[PDB]
Amino acid sequence: MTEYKLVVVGADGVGKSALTIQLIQNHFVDEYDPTIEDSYRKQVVIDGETCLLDILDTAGQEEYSAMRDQYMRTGEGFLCVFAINNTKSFEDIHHYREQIKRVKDSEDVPMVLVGNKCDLPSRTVDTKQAQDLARSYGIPFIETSAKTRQGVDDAFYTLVREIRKHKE
Numbered sequence: 001m002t003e004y005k006l007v008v009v010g011a012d013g014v015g016k017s018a019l020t021i022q023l024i025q026n027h028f029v030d031e032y033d034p035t036i037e038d039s040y041r042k043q044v045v046i047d048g049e050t051c052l053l054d055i056l057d058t059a060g061q062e063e064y065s066a067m068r069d070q071y072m073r074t075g076e077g078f079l080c081v082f083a084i085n086n087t088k089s090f091e092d093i094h095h096y097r098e099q100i101k102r103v104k105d106s107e108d109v110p111m112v113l114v115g116n117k118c119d120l121p122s123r124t125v126d127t128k129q130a131q132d133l134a135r136s137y138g139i140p141f142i143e144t145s146a147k148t149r150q151g152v153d154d155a156f157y158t159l160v161r162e163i164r165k166h167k168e
């Protein structure tokens with residue numbers, strides 16, 4: 001089977017952990033320790049390919065040490081997550097994409113832009129705004145809810161698909 005190393009990044013509170021746990025463990029966590037960073041592995045079939053997904057759920061403090069830089073650059077693809085009711089988290093996307101380009105030392109890194117919490121009633125980030133940002137980057141965009149599980153499998157599988165085509 002093919003191993004894929006995925007890294008879920010984005011501002012605190014956007015739902016990186018809920019998204020990962022929903023995909024790995026099939027349940028919605030409401031109060032996952034905001035500081036716990038860990039890797040999770042899941043065997044799954046994507047487009048008929050058996051895949052082992054190694055998924056780094058990032059957390060902790062905004063540090064830029066050489067060890068963290070090294071942990072991140074093992075990512076083959078990146079889920080860049082913001083929440084549709086958190087303007088600041090959307091604005092922060094550019095920064096995360098810049099940090100990815102830096103530690104990977106490349107301007108084409110497989111990435112998917114993810115607008116989480118789409119179950120929530122009053123969003124301040126419009127679908128169009130985020131699509132526009134995605135198309136500027138050349139990356140896919142998907143809306144997700146870690147609560148209802150909408151889009152969750154597709155967000156991760158779509159990232160896997162972006163890694164395949166980068167590998168040609």
Ligand SMILES: Cc1cccc2cccc(N3CCc4c(nc(OC[C@@H]5CCCN5C)nc4N4CCNC[C@H]4C)C3)c12
Nearest residue numbers: 009010011012059060061062064069072092095099100103
């Ligand atoms: C994420 C990432 C990807 C690829 C390579 C990296 C290399 C080094 C460090 C990384 N990370 C570490 C965690 C982190 C990072 N950048 C911000 O930016 C917060 C705000 C907004 C813009 C500037 N800054 C002021 N915040 C963070 N953390 C806030 C507190 N909890 C967890 C975490 C989300 C950057 C790399």
Ligand SMILES: Nc1nc2c(ncn2[C@@H]2O[C@H](COP(=O)(O)OP(=O)(O)O)[C@@H](O)[C@H]2O)c(=O)[nH]1
Nearest residue numbers: 012013014015016017018029030117145146147
């Ligand atoms: N309503 C709703 N709440 C969510 C969703 N995803 C995460 N949350 C909640 O938002 C908070 C932060 O989620 P968490 O996964 O810890 O964010 P992280 O800092 O990105 O890991 C928690 O209270 C979650 O229960 C979602 O899709 N919808």
Ligand SMILES: [Mg+2]
Nearest residue numbers: 016017034059
């Ligand atoms: Mg978390």
